[PDB]
Design a protein around this ligand. Sequence first.
Ligand code: R4D
Length: 341
Amino acid sequence: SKKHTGYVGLKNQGATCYMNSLLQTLFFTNQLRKAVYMMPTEGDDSSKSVPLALQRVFYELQHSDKPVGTKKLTKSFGWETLDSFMQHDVQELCRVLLDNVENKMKGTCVEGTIPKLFRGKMVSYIQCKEVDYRSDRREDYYDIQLSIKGKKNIFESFVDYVAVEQLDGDNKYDAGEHGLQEAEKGVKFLTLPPVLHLQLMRFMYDPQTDQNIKINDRFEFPEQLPLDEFLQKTDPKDPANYILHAVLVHSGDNHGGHYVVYLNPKGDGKWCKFDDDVVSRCTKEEAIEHNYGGHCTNAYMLVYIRESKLSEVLQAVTDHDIPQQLVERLQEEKRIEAQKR
Ligand SMILES: C[C@H](Cc1ccccc1)C(=O)N1CCC(O)(Cn2cnc3ccccc3c2=O)CC1
């Protein structure tokens, strides 16, 4: 119920798996939401436009007492087949949603919000040992995929991500002028974004079965996340302490299973659980430790917000933050759909 928590649920309208969990995550990323509302969806086709459809879900989630439907959204980005959600990752859906958004906001006041919130920068060095030659290339990322297989916690995942790899023997490095050389290869972070989407590599390939198997191994993540030790140059004025916002959770061993999201919407630490139409209050511990694993129920994705940007990221939202031309068009659609049923 809405009156229980302040928040409404999402309708269950097919095997959308992680979609409802993510939508709620994206919705409670308040700064994104404000920016979605401002998109010039004036001319757009009521069915073929993804940005409108996202504006609709968010509107409804903010205003409706009753659970909110996603069918126009799934039609809008074209994931209407049985195996659509089943064969993709959660981050690939997030990219489909955020790219559509980010492109609509080009030539707009709200330009660049998506990258402002989610784009970090990393380096991918390759260093030869014997003769000197180096390759430093910056890459951008909107999300990170942490390995968990035999890592106790997030600390050990970040250690693994940046750990120096080696290149010798058969699979050596082509240093161009210098021939196929012996060399080290790694990654380091230059910046970590305001909103840190982390995915846990739980659905790993098994060469015996010719299928991905879910790994239910125990994997710990904290409430508070000091990531300063994983940057190339720190900032004393803006250190990289991150707060846990959302724990996207799965139960069972496959796409059928059971997808829930636990969120801390305001960043206070008064958490709620979102199981489609049911939104219940819950403990810090039903959200954090109980999804460590060790049991088929465990976290696959985590959202951390940086303490320095928490208030900005979680800036309050009012009914006055949706433009009235859009508010009108949405209520107009609610009324047209009322005349058919
Ligand atoms: C259908 C599938 C079922 C599932 C498997 C495992 C855990 C939860 C639910 C599902 O719902 N998934 C959405 C979430 C993921 O995307 C997360 N995840 C995992 N492994 C990776 C390996 C390598 C690289 C990136 C990931 C990753 O993102 C798995 C698929």
